[PDB]
């Protein structure tokens, strides 16, 4: 109708991620899978910051998260890393899901990590 | 005891829905029933600020939201929908419940919708 | 790798509840269990501050909260009983886990309940 406002659907390939960008997929599953088994109890998370984002960027990319934290306390982690004020707010994005913090980086790994066992974070503010 | 605070109990019919006053429930149904015909992939839904809520208000109440964007896409597509700072939060409540973010708009739709139709979601900075 | 951040693991025990350390556990439980047979609806819950956060801290530890409420309206009623800006922020944190906003206080009684038959929550915005 005339008063109704039809949402859009956000693009699922709007983020990319530059870590697939640069390094092709057999390299990024080789160095996913010996990390996998130099830390059997750790999950290897690429972290890039959606291009929109204006909150600070991440010096490293690549982080080796135990897999009993939660997304809470990750989320504590990767405030503490990058520039932004105490009243800034900061997004995970998994595939365009927030994930629930309540929920460990070991679960979100097993369902969301891809191929190069990798697990794919964007982080943004809006 | 004296030094415990015994928690109050918040009234679930404070917040009442202008769109639900002004208009008869049958003409409601009728009309939210053509709406999930001509769109069976999306879901109408009614938003409208608490009133004892300070942040902006909604040009629009009706929105046409697809099944699969999450409670998290469409908080974002709110807060860019009314006059309010970056720093300023924002609440969803379906009948004084917060909805988890990584659900479905579809999914809090069929487990809350009435019998109109509509999904109702205040939204509330407090 | 020289690359990749090693997340270190929080101590699980960081956070000392006060009320725990003044109070023996036999005198916490008689107290805890008279309360429940008084308020069969309601649950016993201690809220303290992290030492580390720098938001106000709380007039009274001791809360008899309703069993339906949820831990969202729960987050706004400890929000509007300590000093601190509508932009700060706050976090619950039950065994370093923030508990979902949706579940009840009962659910979260019911799973997370020490032998006291009081639930501890700790807070904080960072």
Known sequence: LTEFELVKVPDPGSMKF????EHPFE?????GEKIRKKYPDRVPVIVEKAPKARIGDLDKKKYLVPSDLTVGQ???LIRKRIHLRA?????????NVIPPTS???GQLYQEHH???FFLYIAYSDE
């Open 27 to 31: 390299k990024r599953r080789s160095e």
């Open 18 to 21: 530059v870590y697939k960008e």
């Open 74 to 76: 990750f989320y504590f």
């Open 87 to 95: 009243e800034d707010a900061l997004f995970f994005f998994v595939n």
């Open 103 to 105: 929920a460990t980086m």
């Open 114 to 116: 891809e191929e190069d």
